[PDB]
């Protein structure tokens with residue numbers, strides 16, 4: 105089993121949990137591909153057996169009365185229907201484990217605190233939209249954010265999938281400009297074009313919240329506008345650079361991923377949006393400073409009167425730090441939950457410690473866990489980590505179009 | 506079977522066909538990735554291989570002299586159980602090993618390397634002057650020049666040379682009446698060895714250590730370094746006038762002396778190579794790591810930052826100014842240094858060159874991305890393939 109060192113302190117542990125990794129990643133002994141962003145009844149039965157085993161362990165009833173009954177119930181159902189149905193408690197446990205198992209999530213200290221909305225009876229895109237609005241309202245909670253997931257009906261033979269076409273519930277439009285550029289968020293050019301193609305009347309601002317394109321089984325996507333008062337936003341200002349407000353920058357409160365597939369015991373939920381609260385560097389560093397995103401870094405540095413004609417003045421580093429300050433200040437001023445990268449990484453270290461005792465290890469993707477600014481100033485930089493795939497899981501899936 | 510590599514900033518795609526050569530295997534399996542871990546008669550096999558590389562590089566594969574050099578290595582191993590490298594081969598392999606180092610962000614320079622051939626060395630005294638030639642050459646009054654000195658290869662039945670220090674220039678680390686260290690904590694061990702072999706310890710936080718040089722089958726001997734030969738830069742800040750009063754310094758020459766050079770199956774456990782610093786190595790890691798000089802809070806106090814809450818980003822602000830002070834001080838002293846923006850931009854050009862030249866480039870994403878401002882540099886947005894090519898610099902155990 106792999107030995108794992110923390111270089112700040114000298115700690116050494118062994119990741120015995122990785123030996124249970126069923127599905128395989130992209131690396132081989134010849135080459136590591138860890139930096140890549142994107143890496144049958146009997147086999148349904150083995151996945152279900154393992155998950156039922158996981159569930160009955162969690163309720164300290166492994167090998168008991170109910171446990172054997174449930175394994176036999178599942179085999180009979182797969183035999184008779186080609187599939188099976190989770191009990192509500194199994195669904196709650198499986199959603200939590202999927203978060204717990206997510207190697208690129210730095211916020212997993214929170215994994216046991218997840219509100220699970222059971223939407224597996226959803227019948228239409230219109231009902232789907234109602235469920236989504238309830239999710240957003242509950243999770244936003246007027247800025248005191250609460251972690252939640254809404255689970256729509258599972259994939260099943262004979263019927264198409266429920267899908268949310270948008271990659272998140274809240275996204276800003278990205279409009280290909282007149283002179284080649286993009287107005288708004290360049291990450292969202294494609295979904296913006298899809299919304300227009302499906303009858304949306306576009307705006308022309310940099311921060312126009314997109315409509316939702318919601319797909320019911322064997323149905324084309326349907327367009328749904330979010331009420332503005334449902335989408336809580338934060339205007340960005342800086343505590344001491346008063347000209348920063350004049351940039352007119354904003355971000356939204358709720359990070360809600362809506363394009364991933366939830367897998368529990370071999371069953372697949374292609375529509376299961378989940379939400380937490382932001383870590384400030386996602387907004388301040390990636391969304392606002394990536395050259396292919398809002399790309400504000402040079403404009404901010406020029407306004408700061410930094411010397412932008414030489415790299416060795418560290419003008420980029422100085423301006424990124426103040427942009428992150430602005431995000432934290434603005435969300436704190438607006439009373440909207442946010443965590444800075446120092447606090448987030450420190451609590452992740454506690455999570456690693458908890459998980460070593462509970463399970464003997466923790467799947468973690470170092471490149472995603474280490475924040476995009478001030479990497480070695482956080483404790484996770486100095487922590488070796490072992491990346492592997494456990495189930496239940498959130499998986500990437502192709503876009504439905 | 507040829508990995509697709511995407512740059513997410515631009516959208517460009519390439520394929521790493523070079524990875525198909527990866528001889529020695531890394532630590533990863535389809536079951537789990539270990540990329541973030543720091544330390545994870547067949548001598549003919551990799552001697553043939555290396556010779557074939559050379560003659561291809563000089564556009565001389567399959568012609569006269571290629572055949573000829575294949576025979577003498579055959580004959581030398583048959584007659585002696587090993588072989589000696591031609592001068593030009595020692596040079597070509599030294600550069601290729603640097604070219605192949607997945608963790609080196611400075612490889613745009615790999616073609617410009619000065620190779621000193623110390624293969625006729627014998628005794629810790631000969632090493633000392635051999636190492637002193639390198640240092641004064643590489644240092645060059647602050648106009649740093651990349652250089653490697655190749656001490657004799659390893660032979661069966663006896664010896665091998667070793668430099669006991671991890672680098673040629675290391676600051677001492679002294680324990681206290683309470684354990685905690687004055688000086689560099691990373692060097693507490695070699696410091697205790699240097700004293701243990703009879704060295705008068707200094708009192709201070711930046712005492713340059715003596716060298717423990719090991720001739721084959723000898724107890725090592727201590728060697729003072731001439732102070733005028735160890736170029737150091739006192740640290741000041743352009744606008745924070747008190748920064749000089751913190752009394753911080755770093756040395757000019759980064760020279761790694763504990764690594765084993767391997768060319769064509771031959772092994773050189775003493776083969777120090779040197780370049781010039783990227784400023785985050787000094788300003789971020791050496792000075793701000795909690796287990797190194799750990800000065801971050803002291804600088805933040807002097808800057809009157811709000812260290813009471815993490816969300817003031819006081820750590821980030823103090824760290825940036827420490828890096829500013831490093832770059833400013835090295836430039837004022839006219840000592841070659843490169844900032845992490847310039848360094849990573851040059852590495853992107855290196856990747857582009859290597860794609861044309863060899864169809865790929867082994868790169869360790871976690872080590873290429875700088876330890877501050879990661880996503881502000883282009884390498885953050887570049888997918889990379891990590892694998893082992895030969896010739897290579899390899900890690901080796903401590904000589905005890």
Ligand code: HEM
Pocket residue numbers: 199202203206208209210211212214218251252253378379380381382383386443448472498
């Ligand atoms: C409660 C506060 C939370 C914080 C602070 C947090 C933080 C983060 C961050 C910073 C990332 C990397 C995102 C990126 O760079 O694109 C991430 C990824 C992720 N998070 Fe969390 N998260 C939280 C809650 C949750 C919840 C509630 C779930 C699911 C139940 C979850 C599941 C995931 C998954 C699956 C990923 C990987 C997404 C991907 O790889 O594209 N997180 N999280």
Ligand code: HEM
Pocket residue numbers: 599603606608609610611612614618651652653778779780781782783786843848872898
């Ligand atoms: C010319 C300027 C150079 C720069 C700016 C540079 C930069 C760097 C940096 C920043 C590292 C990371 C080391 C660490 O974080 O501890 C590194 C590692 C490394 N460098 Fe370069 N380097 C240069 C020249 C060279 C030369 C001349 C050689 C050998 C001939 C070389 C071979 C290596 C190797 C083998 C490593 C891996 C060290 C390890 O794995 O611990 N570099 N370099």
Ligand SMILES: CNCc1cncc(-c2cc(C)cc(N)n2)c1
Pocket residue numbers: 211359360361378379380381382383386
């Ligand atoms: C494609 N990257 C996935 C992604 C993108 N944006 C934001 C997140 C995210 C998700 C959650 C639940 C919390 C958080 N703090 N962040 C994940």
Ligand SMILES: CNCc1cncc(-c2cc(C)cc(N)n2)c1
Pocket residue numbers: 759760761778779780781782783786
């Ligand atoms: C433990 N990593 C090895 C190490 C440690 N310190 C510094 C370097 C280094 C080496 C070279 C040639 C250049 C540079 N700019 N830096 C390498």
Ligand SMILES: C[C@H](O)[C@H](O)[C@H]1CNc2nc(N)[nH]c(=O)c2N1
Pocket residue numbers: 139140141471472473513885886887888889
């Ligand atoms: C190529 C590289 O893997 C890619 O840019 C990754 C690096 N680490 C990351 N880490 C997080 N948290 N989010 C990201 O999008 C990325 N991007």
Ligand SMILES: C[C@H](O)[C@H](O)[C@H]1CNc2nc(N)[nH]c(=O)c2N1
Pocket residue numbers: 111485486487488489540541542543871872873
């Ligand atoms: C655990 C982790 O791999 C370790 O801290 C690595 C990360 N990346 C690094 N990158 C460089 N250049 N140098 C280092 O020492 C490290 N340390």
Ligand SMILES: [Cl-]
Pocket residue numbers: 359386391
């Ligand atoms: Cl986001």
Ligand SMILES: [Cl-]
Pocket residue numbers: 759786791
């Ligand atoms: Cl160093």
Ligand SMILES: [Gd+3]
Pocket residue numbers: 344345346
């Ligand atoms: Gd003011």
Ligand SMILES: [Gd+3]
Pocket residue numbers: none
């Ligand atoms: Gd303007």
Ligand SMILES: [Gd+3]
Pocket residue numbers: none
């Ligand atoms: Gd005062």
Ligand SMILES: [Zn+2]
Pocket residue numbers: 131135136137138533537538539540
């Ligand atoms: Zn790997």
